[PDB]
Amino acid sequence: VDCTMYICGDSTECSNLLLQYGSFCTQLNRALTGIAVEQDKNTQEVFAQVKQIYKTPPIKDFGGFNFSQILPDPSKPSKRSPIEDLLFNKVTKFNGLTVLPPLLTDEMIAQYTSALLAGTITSGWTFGAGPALQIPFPMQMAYRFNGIGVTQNVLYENQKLIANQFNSAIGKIQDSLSSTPSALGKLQDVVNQNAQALNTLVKQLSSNFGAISSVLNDILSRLDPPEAEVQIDRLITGRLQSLQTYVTQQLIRAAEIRASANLAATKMSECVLGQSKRVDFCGKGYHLMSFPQSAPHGVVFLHVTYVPAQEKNFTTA
Amino acid sequence: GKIQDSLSSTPSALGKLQDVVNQNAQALNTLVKQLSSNFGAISSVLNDILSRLDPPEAEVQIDRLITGRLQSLQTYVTQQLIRAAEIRASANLAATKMSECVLGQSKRVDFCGKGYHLMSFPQSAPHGVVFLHVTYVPAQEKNFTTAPAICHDGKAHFPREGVFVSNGTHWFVTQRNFYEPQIITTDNTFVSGNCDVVIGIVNNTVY
Amino acid sequence: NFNFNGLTGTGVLTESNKKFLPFQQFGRDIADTTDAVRDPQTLEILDITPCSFGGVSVITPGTNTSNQVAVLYQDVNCTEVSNVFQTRAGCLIGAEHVNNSYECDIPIGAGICASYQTQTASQSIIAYTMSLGAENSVAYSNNSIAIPTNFTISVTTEILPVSMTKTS
Ligand SMILES: *[C@@H]1O[C@H](CO)[C@@H](O[C@@H]2O[C@H](CO)[C@@H](O[C@@H]3O[C@H](CO)[C@@H](O)[C@H](O)[C@@H]3O)[C@H](O)[C@H]2NC(C)=O)[C@H](O)[C@H]1NC(C)=O
Ligand SMILES: *[C@@H]1O[C@H](CO)[C@@H](O[C@@H]2O[C@H](CO)[C@@H](O)[C@H](O)[C@H]2NC(C)=O)[C@H](O)[C@H]1NC(C)=O
Ligand SMILES: *[C@@H]1O[C@H](CO)[C@@H](O[C@@H]2O[C@H](CO)[C@@H](O)[C@H](O)[C@H]2NC(C)=O)[C@H](O)[C@H]1NC(C)=O
Ligand SMILES: *[C@@H]1O[C@H](CO)[C@@H](O)[C@H](O)[C@H]1NC(C)=O
Ligand SMILES: *[C@@H]1O[C@H](CO)[C@@H](O)[C@H](O)[C@H]1NC(C)=O
Ligand SMILES: *[C@@H]1O[C@H](CO)[C@@H](O)[C@H](O)[C@H]1NC(C)=O
Ligand SMILES: *[C@@H]1O[C@H](CO)[C@@H](O)[C@H](O)[C@H]1NC(C)=O
Ligand SMILES: *[C@@H]1O[C@H](CO)[C@@H](O)[C@H](O)[C@H]1NC(C)=O
Ligand SMILES: *[C@@H]1O[C@H](CO)[C@@H](O)[C@H](O)[C@H]1NC(C)=O
Numbered sequence: 001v002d003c004t005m006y007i008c009g010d011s012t013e014c015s016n017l018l019l020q021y022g023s024f025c026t027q028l029n030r031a032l033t034g035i036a037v038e039q040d041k042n043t044q045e046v047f048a049q050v051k052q053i054y055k056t057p058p059i060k061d062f063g064g065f066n067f068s069q070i071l072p073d074p075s076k077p078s079k080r081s082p083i084e085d086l087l088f089n090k091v092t093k094f095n096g097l098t099v100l101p102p103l104l105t106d107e108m109i110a111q112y113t114s115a116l117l118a119g120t121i122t123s124g125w126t127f128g129a130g131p132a133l134q135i136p137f138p139m140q141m142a143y144r145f146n147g148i149g150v151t152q153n154v155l156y157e158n159q160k161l162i163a164n165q166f167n168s169a170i171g172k173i174q175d176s177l178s179s180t181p182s183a184l185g186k187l188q189d190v191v192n193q194n195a196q197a198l199n200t201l202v203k204q205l206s207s208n209f210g211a212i213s214s215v216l217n218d219i220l221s222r223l224d225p226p227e228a229e230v231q232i233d234r235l236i237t238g239r240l241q242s243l244q245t246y247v248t249q250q251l252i253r254a255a256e257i258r259a260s261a262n263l264a265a266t267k268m269s270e271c272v273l274g275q276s277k278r279v280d281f282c283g284k285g286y287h288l289m290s291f292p293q294s295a296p297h298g299v300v301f302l303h304v305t306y307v308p309a310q311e312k313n314f315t316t317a
Numbered sequence: 318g319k320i321q322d323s324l325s326s327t328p329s330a331l332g333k334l335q336d337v338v339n340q341n342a343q344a345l346n347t348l349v350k351q352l353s354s355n356f357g358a359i360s361s362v363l364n365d366i367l368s369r370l371d372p373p374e375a376e377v378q379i380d381r382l383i384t385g386r387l388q389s390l391q392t393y394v395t396q397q398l399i400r401a402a403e404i405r406a407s408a409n410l411a412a413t414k415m416s417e418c419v420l421g422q423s424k425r426v427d428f429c430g431k432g433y434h435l436m437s438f439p440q441s442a443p444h445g446v447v448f449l450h451v452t453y454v455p456a457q458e459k460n461f462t463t464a465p466a467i468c469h470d471g472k473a474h475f476p477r478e479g480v481f482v483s484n485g486t487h488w489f490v491t492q493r494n495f496y497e498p499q500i501i502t503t504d505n506t507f508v509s510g511n512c513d514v515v516i517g518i519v520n521n522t523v524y
Numbered sequence: 525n526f527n528f529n530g531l532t533g534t535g536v537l538t539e540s541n542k543k544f545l546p547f548q549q550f551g552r553d554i555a556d557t558t559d560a561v562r563d564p565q566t567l568e569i570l571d572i573t574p575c576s577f578g579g580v581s582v583i584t585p586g587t588n589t590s591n592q593v594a595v596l597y598q599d600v601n602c603t604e605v606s607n608v609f610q611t612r613a614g615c616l617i618g619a620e621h622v623n624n625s626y627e628c629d630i631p632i633g634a635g636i637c638a639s640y641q642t643q644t645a646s647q648s649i650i651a652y653t654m655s656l657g658a659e660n661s662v663a664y665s666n667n668s669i670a671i672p673t674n675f676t677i678s679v680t681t682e683i684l685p686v687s688m689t690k691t692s
Binding site: 319320323324330331333334337338341342345393397400401403404407408410411414429430431432435442444445446447448449450451452453454455456457458459460461462463464480482491493494495496516517 | 666667668669670671672673674675676677678679680681682683684685686687688689691
Binding site for chain 3: 002005010040048050051052053054055056057058059061093094095096098100101102103104105107108111112115118122123131132133134135136137138139199202203
């Protein structure tokens with residue numbers, strides 16, 4: 001935000017009166033800059049977790065699994081995976097209020113995400129902690145089961161069933177997200193709340209707060225100079241309060257978002273770049289794997305766990 | 318030794334605390350500098366107006382400045398209160414790492430830095446804590462032919478620990494974190510399933 | 525600087541792609557600010573665009589080794605602000621641009637970061653596409669695993685804030 005523009009730009013008298021409040025809005029211009037910087041830091045903490053960008057193999061040996069639904073599709077005009085596409089198509093001036101571009105764009109996020117996914121499928125934790133190791137998906141699966149104390153024979157006996165359960169669940173996720181848009185509320189609310197706070201700030205510029213006119217550059221051209229100064233001081237104060245209110249809310253929301261980003265970054269390490277046993281940490285059950293996906297303003301993880309299905313009562317000691 | 322050289326040659330490495338102290342000092346110094354703002358008054362100084370202006374005009378301008386000075390204090394407190402929430406979160410993380418990596422060796426993934434945590438050590442600092450995080454990271458690796466099991470007498474023999482490996486002539490058993498191959502014996506393997514189940518199963522005598 | 529039958533403000537007009545009702549001499553956007561106006565002597569709907577503005581930031585090497593700088597003017601043309609790089613992240617004046625991918629040094633925005641390579645050598649500011657590191661397209665096979673032999677003990681640092689100035 002350019003506070004000179006928001007309060008009253010292109011006016012000698014508005015500038016001279018705005019300056020009587022010192023750094024009151026200068027520090028807010030700084031607070032917003034700081035928030036924008038943090039937003040790129042949050043993005044880097046969550047997605048730039050590979051030593052170097054890694055790419056998937058030329059041969060998609062996924063053991064019967066469809067990871068084509070999670071990995072970005074390079075043949076499309078928008079390189080997004082089918083799940084990312086569903087989300088991206090659903091999660092959505094002269095007054096000095098503008099929005100700056102990200103440093104790390106959606107495509108580059110998708111590129112880090114692809115590297116993380118490539119590891120999730122064929123190298124596991126090694127794209128992170130040291131040189132990558134060659135750990136082909138079928139073996140990585142044998143290891144995902146051994147990691148929860150389950151003999152790898154379940155993988156081979158049920159190789160088709162295991163891939164089908166994964167693939168089926170992906171289809172269910174796609175069907176849910178495509179029909180229940182509120183499922184994306186975690187990001188939709190962020191964009192709507194920040195947009196509303198800012199749009200409200202714009203609407204509030206028209207409040208007069210008891211002033212003869214709600215517009216600072218109207219008063220200076222309408223009232224005798226000392227009368228104008230009084231009416232201008234009242235509106236500048238009201239406009240400054242609106243800027244401070246907005247920034248304070250954005251600073252608090254940034255704290256919540258930074259915390260969310262830190263949690264997201266933690267999940268990436270615990271379920272994407274490992275198979276953590278912290279109970280139900282990245283979803284209920286024992287972790288096997290997790291697949292990150294990009295999103296406007298966020299990250300999506302597909303949480304894969306081992307969950308008992310049928311059970312029986314046996315005599316014990 | 319590399320850490321000491323890094324910290325002394327790259328003082329920007331200390332930015333996690335240096336920026337915090339400078340930001341707080343600046344916020345407080347700003348609070349002082351803003352004492353000079355007049356907020357519509359003839360003068361920004363309350364004790365100047367009281368001995369300079371005709372008392373009823375002085376009263377009005379004094380109240381304007383009291384409000385202005387109050388707003389500066391309210392602003393400061395809110396900003397420090399929000400920053401305090403971030404600092405508390407940082408302190409909580411620091412406390413978490415000190416218990417989990419320093420008095421421990423947490424397996425949380427790359428939690429205290431990339432690699433498996435072997436150990437961690439805290440150092441004091443103005444306004445904060447410095448940690449030396451020590452991890453285990455593979456230096457070298459080699460590509461070996463592998464199998465989840467070997468086929469012997471129609472059954473699948475699984476390693477009790479590790480994966481079966483080969484250099485092209487003989488099969489052995491190794492761990493994922495270190496290529497120290499063992500002879501395949503009945504003391505190192507277990508039997509389950511069969512040769513028609515394991516994918517990647519290879520034919521190898523079990524002693 | 526506009527005044528159409530009492531409707532005032534500032535901006536740039538262009539032809540719109542929308543139609544208004546006979547009772548609608550102007551339109552407004554999401555926050556009820558002018559979207560477009562109609563010309564009372566030639567009715568036509570003309571979209572109003574805010575007059576070019578944006579923030580200005582400077583990309584600089586440290587002044588301890590060199591003083592070549594380039595300036596980014598956000599959301600504006602290179603002609604509104606010699607070696608000019610046009611981008612929505614802001615036109616970088618006093619810099620060149622290269623198509624090849626490199627690491628990030630000083631961010632411009634929207635996927636581009638400036639760096640300071642020399643040429644025949646003089647140092648200059650060149651805007652570059654971000655690479656995200658080497659593309660390690662590792663291939664895998666169900667019958668082969670990279671297994672660690674020896675290891676290194678890596679020690680790194682982390683510094684965390686614990687406390688603030690005890691303001692009283
Ligand atoms: C208000 O009155 C003015 C009178 O100047 C109107 O302008 C006139 O508009 C007519 C209709 O377009 C023009 O006649 C024709 O113009 C076309 C192209 O402009 C030309 O190819 C034809 O040969 C013919 O001259 C006329 O020139 C134009 N007069 C001007 C521009 O001076 C205007 O339309 C009226 N506006 C409203 C809202 O009623
Ligand atoms: C992964 O999912 C894609 C998308 O559904 C599958 O592509 C379909 O393939 C079937 C037959 O193989 C075709 O009849 C469909 O027209 C394809 N769908 C689309 C949208 O093109 C693909 O087969 C799946 N891959 C695996 C290994 O299951
Ligand atoms: C465990 O549940 C799975 C569900 O995937 C069972 O697999 C199904 O088995 C039924 C009949 O046994 C078949 O009609 C289905 O076609 C199977 N599903 C798939 C995806 O193949 C499996 O039989 C169960 N296993 C045990 C040991 O009970
Ligand atoms: C095992 O016993 C519990 C306790 O009565 C009962 O609720 C459950 O149905 C039994 N489960 C099976 C598989 O018989
Ligand atoms: C390994 O032994 C099995 C008997 O269980 C046999 O069917 C198979 O052909 C053998 N594989 C070889 C010789 O590669
Ligand atoms: C593979 O290793 C075994 C013992 O570890 C040895 O007998 C054999 O000569 C090795 N083969 C090659 C090709 O090095
Ligand atoms: C590995 O998979 C490939 C195709 O993905 C197949 O041709 C080959 O037979 C498999 N090898 C083993 C040992 O299963
Ligand atoms: C520069 O102007 C061109 C047309 O002259 C326009 O298409 C483009 O959007 C402008 N660039 C910026 C960053 O405003
Ligand atoms: C690890 O082994 C490699 C050869 O594979 C050797 O070059 C290197 O010096 C060893 N590293 C250490 C730390 O001993």
